[PDB]
Amino acid sequence: ALVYDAEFVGSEREFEEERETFLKGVKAYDGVLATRYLMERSSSAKNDEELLELHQNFILLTGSYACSIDPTEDRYQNVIVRGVNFDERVQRLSTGGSPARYAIVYRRGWRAIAKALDIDEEDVPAIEVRAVKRNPLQPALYRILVRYGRVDLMPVTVDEVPPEMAGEFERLIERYDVPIDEKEERILEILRENPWTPHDEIARRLGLSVSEVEGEKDPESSGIYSLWSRVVVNIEYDERTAKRHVKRRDRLLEELYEHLEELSERYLRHPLTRRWIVEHKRDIMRRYLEQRIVECALKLQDRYGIREDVALCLARAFDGSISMIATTPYRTLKDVCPDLTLEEAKSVNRTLATLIDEHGLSPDAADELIEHFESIAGILATDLEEIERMYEEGRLSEEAYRAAVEIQLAELTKKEGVGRKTAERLLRAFGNPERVKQLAREFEIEKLASVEGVGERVLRSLVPGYASLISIRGIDRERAERLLKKYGGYSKVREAGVEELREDGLTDAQIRELKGLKTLESIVGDLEKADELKRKYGSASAVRRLPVEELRELGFSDDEIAEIKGIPKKLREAFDLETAAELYERYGSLKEIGRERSEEEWKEWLERKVGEGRARRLIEYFGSAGEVGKLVENAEVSKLLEVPGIGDEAVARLVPGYKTLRDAGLTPAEAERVLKRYGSVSKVQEGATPDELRELGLGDAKIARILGLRSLVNKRLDVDTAYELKRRYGSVSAVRKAPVKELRELGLSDRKIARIKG
């Protein structure tokens, strides 16, 4: 068994009220477990909808009591979870906080707290707060509230859950204006689609690990946990709302149990009473555990390719929890499952994998970092001088200590302009790289520049939008910081009103360059107007290609409108401005504007057959489209082919039957004589004779194809006899069925009769 422990150092009074709080939590979480038990089998739409709400209500109250654990954040010490000291982990965080509540947010973290409070009134006095799918709140936010003991923020009734803490979580994020890095934006993208997307799924879709997605439960980190921490610490604590919540929840917990009892009869023989849950607690927990072990073991095989026996071993030893395994040191994993290979361990523990493969650490040195900092994010969240203090006190080996420092430095030196000495100076002045990165995002340019080594290039790579503004001539460092802070980033500086920027001290040339209004100010002399059009429409091409009515409507004179559209003056007073523009932006220029069946009918007929391009080639070559149409009707193939760009393909599309004759091996001239003489390939097959085709200069081979005789010529019959055989009888098929003696009367030999018949 792994080590869970904690000692209570509060007074006797504080011991009593703390056990009171924890036991209420256990009782609330029993409701989560009991309702979960019922939800395993569906009933009816209205029944399990009522059951779901009850479930969520238990989740809220469990969360609320969890928030109340360790209010003064000093009633516990030496909080140990699975051999790991949580006191040291929470103290390293910039916001600190209760190590007890910190433990609760972890799976089975309640075990350390239950031991400290001597909870023995119930078999498995669990309090969990990691519900995802059925959580009435945004799951990450829910855990962060518990972490920060926000009794004031945690709702005590599903009906009183603010949308901004659930589906509309975006409203809460935008309300307090916190810095958000690129990775966090990628995560929020997924969560906007589905706020209740599991973190393993988010990681899978972003090509990240769970740890990268989650981050530390502190503002100075990166991930969804860090983002929510960044928001929540900005929300002032409401003591009155907290006390109202505390005043109401005990009574609410009883109502939920009364509701549970009545609703349970709708699902079972006997009601689910408080007494029933307590007595069957151990069996309910075991049932949950065994089915989690199965699912976990399968996942270890499917996703991580771990052997079955090893997977089953790991799953049981760690409560069927992948996230518990993924944060467990290699040695601890190998102690409970000796058959585990390092590659298998590196497969599930991405932190271990990265520390070894991407940072050349030994497994033992990596295990030090995992036990002390949990992940890379933990190292980045930790102040440099704190890591150095840990080394001096002999609580970190040399290999582990130096690797920590290198990881902390590399986070900054990967930026252009930042060397080791400058990176180190930034860490000593601002603690950790995450703080340094957040200062840049808050545009604290002067603050960062107070450090030696931090000049223009460093500021260009660290501070978002700084390089963009400082590139504009006449804008120095001081003004860049003012503009960035005032409007909240480069893009919003660029969106600011013209008059605003002028009174900020910017020149019209600077504003023009900022908004890219150059080509639009050339079109119209005003800058505000040019910006309004850039805003209202899209580009210079959009304003230019606008209808003339709307341009006059915008306040443009007809002189300007023609100038904008580029309409020359012999076109302006020749027509009205409406038609003058219509004709100009239809053709290239002025001189290109200088451009049984009728002419237009023949034109559109040609454009349908050979295309508009090839048709114009024909119209230009000859007199008109009516002349081309006259050649087509007379099967003048050769003369049509005299046109450059017009080959067999186009001619075949123009004159019917030509392709057929070309396929049969006839030259264009030969096909022309046939089409002229007979009119159509159909009438050729129906009426033309071999003697007539030989007159047109055709050889016996082509004639066979033309008359469709090759199905008889192949039987070593000549064209003449095949033609006569195909004529007297219906078709080629009918000849084969003809009487033998009837063939003999026609003069056919026994060998030819044999070839025909078989």
mmCIF file with all atom_site columns, C-alpha atoms in Angstrom, residues 125 167 185 243 310 322 350 357 361 405 413 440 503 510 610 653 657 733 735 744:
data_model
loop_
_atom_site.group_PDB
_atom_site.id
_atom_site.type_symbol
_atom_site.label_atom_id
_atom_site.label_alt_id
_atom_site.label_comp_id
_atom_site.label_asym_id
_atom_site.label_entity_id
_atom_site.label_seq_id
_atom_site.pdbx_PDB_ins_code
_atom_site.Cartn_x
_atom_site.Cartn_y
_atom_site.Cartn_z
_atom_site.occupancy
_atom_site.B_iso_or_equiv
_atom_site.pdbx_formal_charge
_atom_site.auth_seq_id
_atom_site.auth_comp_id
_atom_site.auth_asym_id
_atom_site.auth_atom_id
_atom_site.pdbx_PDB_model_num
ATOM 1  C CA . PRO A 1 125 ? -15.055 7.930   3.934    1.00 0.00 ? 125 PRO A CA 1
ATOM 2  C CA . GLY A 1 167 ? -21.769 26.171  -20.504  1.00 0.00 ? 167 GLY A CA 1
ATOM 3  C CA . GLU A 1 185 ? -6.255  29.568  -26.549  1.00 0.00 ? 185 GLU A CA 1
ATOM 4  C CA . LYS A 1 243 ? -22.172 32.375  4.945    1.00 0.00 ? 243 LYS A CA 1
ATOM 5  C CA . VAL A 1 310 ? 1.399   -5.646  -16.401  1.00 0.00 ? 310 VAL A CA 1
ATOM 6  C CA . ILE A 1 322 ? -4.534  6.544   -15.570  1.00 0.00 ? 322 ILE A CA 1
ATOM 7  C CA . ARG A 1 350 ? 4.929   11.427  -20.443  1.00 0.00 ? 350 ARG A CA 1
ATOM 8  C CA . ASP A 1 357 ? 14.483  11.303  -24.010  1.00 0.00 ? 357 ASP A CA 1
ATOM 9  C CA . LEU A 1 361 ? 18.217  12.451  -17.533  1.00 0.00 ? 361 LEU A CA 1
ATOM 10 C CA . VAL A 1 405 ? 18.048  24.880  -14.013  1.00 0.00 ? 405 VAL A CA 1
ATOM 11 C CA . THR A 1 413 ? 16.925  31.286  -24.191  1.00 0.00 ? 413 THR A CA 1
ATOM 12 C CA . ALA A 1 440 ? 5.577   40.436  -21.287  1.00 0.00 ? 440 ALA A CA 1
ATOM 13 C CA . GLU A 1 503 ? -4.863  62.630  -29.243  1.00 0.00 ? 503 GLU A CA 1
ATOM 14 C CA . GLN A 1 510 ? 1.782   56.754  -38.278  1.00 0.00 ? 510 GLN A CA 1
ATOM 15 C CA . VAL A 1 610 ? -16.425 24.224  -78.727  1.00 0.00 ? 610 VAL A CA 1
ATOM 16 C CA . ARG A 1 653 ? -17.988 18.650  -81.432  1.00 0.00 ? 653 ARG A CA 1
ATOM 17 C CA . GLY A 1 657 ? -20.560 11.720  -87.243  1.00 0.00 ? 657 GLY A CA 1
ATOM 18 C CA . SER A 1 733 ? -25.825 -12.267 -86.009  1.00 0.00 ? 733 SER A CA 1
ATOM 19 C CA . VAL A 1 735 ? -26.050 -14.653 -90.944  1.00 0.00 ? 735 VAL A CA 1
ATOM 20 C CA . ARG A 1 744 ? -24.113 -23.051 -100.805 1.00 0.00 ? 744 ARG A CA 1
#
